[PDB]
Design a protein around this motif. Structure first.
Motif: not given
Ligand code: GSH
Ligand code: GSH
Lengths: 236, 220
Positions: A168, A183, A190, A194
């Motif tokens: 984060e 990602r 990541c 999540r």
């Molecule tokens: N799937 C999302 C982003 C997914 C993602 O990258 N999630 C990670 C970042 S590496 C995250 O921030 N996790 C916390 C959360 O999404 O709750 C998109 O289409 O942009």
């Protein structure tokens, strides 16, 4: 608001968000005491500032504890995170915390403070280096991050809370534009972040999550300067 | 050798760990890797690989019995000393030496006094909880002691001898503690092989000259 557990820090993410998560996720009642920076010169040489006049501090049922890393380990002991683990297994979990705190959380904060701590610095030259180091370290952590579950196995331990906040923190610096790149480089970290965000016992913590990473007077200003720089090419 | 510490031939992140191993009744290979999670220091201990300076300190603390008969609050006081000394002092001293290689274009005359200032203030806070006699560990040294003593040597290394007088004045008990550590018989070989540079800087000697030309003793 009178709790036997009290975590003291500024109203920002920096060094304490992981600690907030560990306490909330154990479903402990605790006071999340957020001390404004304008009021901090009053607290330095009082009990809230502790032995070293610095934050975070924790009070746990009468026992005062200081410094992020020491608090983390104190909580790990207190919450049973090391039950049935030999010194080598414990040391692996403490290496994760230490890496996330030292190499990511303190460094992200230094990047945000870079102007005011290093006058005349060329951001365009300095940032790619320091940031590249930071991603390199997380890249190595990623290689030993499990595909499913936690560093703690079937349940989260301190390492898990710190690893998720390291992601984060990085995501906060970069901005949402670069999620896809993250990602790709850090798939398992990541996914872990999540999972941590979806834990029901953390709903209030997410609800009351602090907006800024440091107490920088204009942090928003600094970010747009940092995001004007080509940080995406560093990841890829 | 069942015990091996791997680091560069410099002080930075590992001297306190060298001291803990030497001061204990323990044979170990001090493996020094030429200056040219894939990071150092690393420790191998009877088949167990350990990484990251702080985690190694805590691993040794457990292995060497430093936490026997201490409650969790007591253990955490000791661990906070290690963390203050390493992250707020030793790591920052290293940062000052690397400062214009990592922050290209920095004006050192403004930057350094401020960062050197913060660093000194942290140690002055610790000074007030440093014992006058003995160690943080009580009768024997624990990890807190080894780190605290190297934090002083780091500061001394940076300033130079000229300003020794002022250090004792600002930090008597830490200065005495560091002095005591230097005379522990069990550490004589470590002091004999003590590395001559703090970091793996390309030319640290030249960097030191530049830094000492600033008004550093003013910070005390
Ligand atoms: N799937 C999302 C982003 C997914 C993602 O990258 N999630 C990670 C970042 S590496 C995250 O921030 N996790 C916390 C959360 O999404 O709750 C998109 O289409 O942009
Ligand atoms: N007082 C001695 C100097 C010794 C000295 O530097 N003492 C303290 C000053 S903070 C120290 O750093 N001792 C550590 C050591 O002996 O290695 C002299 O001037 O002859």
């Amino acid at each position: 608001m009178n709790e036997p557990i009290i975590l003291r820090y500024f109203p920002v993410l920096g060094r304490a968000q992981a600690l907030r998560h560990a306490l909330a996720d154990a479903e402990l009642a605790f006071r999340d005491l957020r001390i404004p920076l304008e009021q901090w010169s009053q607290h330095k040489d009082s009990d809230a500032g502790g032995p070293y006049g610095s934050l975070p501090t924790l009070r746990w049922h009468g026992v005062e504890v200081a410094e992020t890393i020491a608090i983390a380990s104190f909580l790990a002991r207190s919450l049973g995170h090391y039950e049935g683990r030999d010194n080598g297994e414990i040391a692996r979990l403490e290496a994760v915390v230490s890496l996330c705190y030292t190499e990511v959380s303190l460094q992200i904060a230094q990047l945000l403070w870079l102007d005011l701590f290093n006058p005349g610095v060329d951001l365009a030259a300095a940032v790619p280096l320091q940031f590249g180091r930071l991603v390199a370290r997380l890249t190595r952590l990623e290689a030993h991050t499990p595909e499913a579950g936690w560093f703690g196995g079937e349940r989260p331990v301190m390492a898990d809370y710190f690893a998720a906040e390291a992601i984060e923190a990085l995501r906060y610096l970069l901005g949402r534009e670069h999620d896809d790149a993250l990602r790709t480089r850090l798939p398992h970290l990541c996914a872990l972040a999540r999972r941590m965000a979806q834990r029901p016992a953390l709903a209030q913590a997410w609800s009351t999550r602090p907006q800024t990473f440091t107490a920088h007077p204009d942090e928003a200003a600094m970010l747009e300067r940092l995001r004007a720089l080509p940080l995406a090419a560093t990841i890829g």
